[PDB]
From Swiss-Prot, chains A, B:
Principal location: cytoplasm
Required cofactor names: Zn(2+)
GO molecular function, one term: metal ion binding
Lineage, highest ranks first: Bacteria, Pseudomonadati, Pseudomonadota, Gammaproteobacteria, Pasteurellales
Protein name: N-acetylneuraminate anomerase
Catalytic activity as recorded in UniProt: N-acetyl-alpha-neuraminate = aceneuramate; N-acetyl-beta-neuraminate = aceneuramate
Primary role: Opens both the alpha- and beta-forms of N-acetylneuraminate (sialic acid; Neu5Ac) to provide aceneuramate, the preferred substrate for NanA. Has preferential activity on the beta-anomer rather than the alpha-anomer. Accelerates a reaction that is spontaneous at slightly alkaline pH, facilitates the reaction at acidic pH.
Length: 140, 140
């Protein structure tokens, strides 16, 4: 997983070019003015902007970007025990499970971003605006 | 920041080679078996294996691994404000401060690895056997 800030001079270090090309372009947008909903980007990457169990993916990574508020995401980094997982919904790429093993809590502040690769589980629940960029693993 | 698990089949996906080269080298060893102390890996890269204020670095990234026990590391993904930091030590690449802004706590269990690039404040608070690999950012 990767957790950094759009605001930090060097956030680009170590990133996969594609997630990098895109944090460049978010830095272009007036993130605050973005309309909640799904915004397309290229032909493969889209965006969902949102304003108010754990989840994981097979096909896409998430780049999460808090834009306003403060948010605690639950996150695991050990590969999940799949056998305990609800099943996969081939339509929205996901499986759910009540729990995360080896769990820790990342608190996001405006600027923070978080990339969870497929199977890295997470759980935006709690304690706002943000967006979540869908990037197909293949592109990395 | 990178948080990930030297233990899930997709770990290398997204990892800078240099760092992959190292997870390799590591995954090819007896880490319980490791002599505490500085082990040199090549001419540029060296590791500290260890059996136990915030630190930041300019020149070298930490690959940290927990080999056993459980370890809690407070961690900053936003740019430190460097006026508070204490004062660079060039010989051991570090600057301290008692605090971290926008702190979070990552919990290390064995098989788990955190890459911290320069200016990422970190505090192995530890609520144990570990290693920290030093790798020069020139190389990512
Ligand atoms: Hg991005
Ligand atoms: Hg997700
Ligand atoms: Hg669960
Ligand atoms: Hg590793
Ligand atoms: Hg360090
Ligand atoms: Hg400080």
């Amino acid at each position: 997983m990767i957790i950094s800030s759009l605001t930090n001079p060097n956030f680009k270090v170590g990133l996969p070019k594609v997630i990098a090309e895109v944090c460049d372009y978010l830095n272009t947008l007036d993130l605050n003015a973005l309309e909640n909903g799904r915004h397309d980007i290229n032909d493969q990457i889209y965006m969902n902007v949102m304003e108010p169990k754990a989840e994981l993916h097979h096909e896409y990574l998430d780049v999460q970007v808090l834009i306003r508020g403060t948010e605690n995401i639950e996150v695991g980094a050990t590969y999940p025990n799949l056998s305990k997982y609800e099943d996969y919904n081939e339509a929205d790429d996901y499986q759910l499970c009540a729990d995360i093993d080896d769990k820790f809590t990342v608190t996001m502040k405006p600027k923070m971003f978080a990339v969870f690769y497929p199977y890295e589980p997470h759980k935006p629940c709690c304690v706002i605006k943000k967006l979540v960029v869908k990037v197909p693993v293949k592109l990395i």
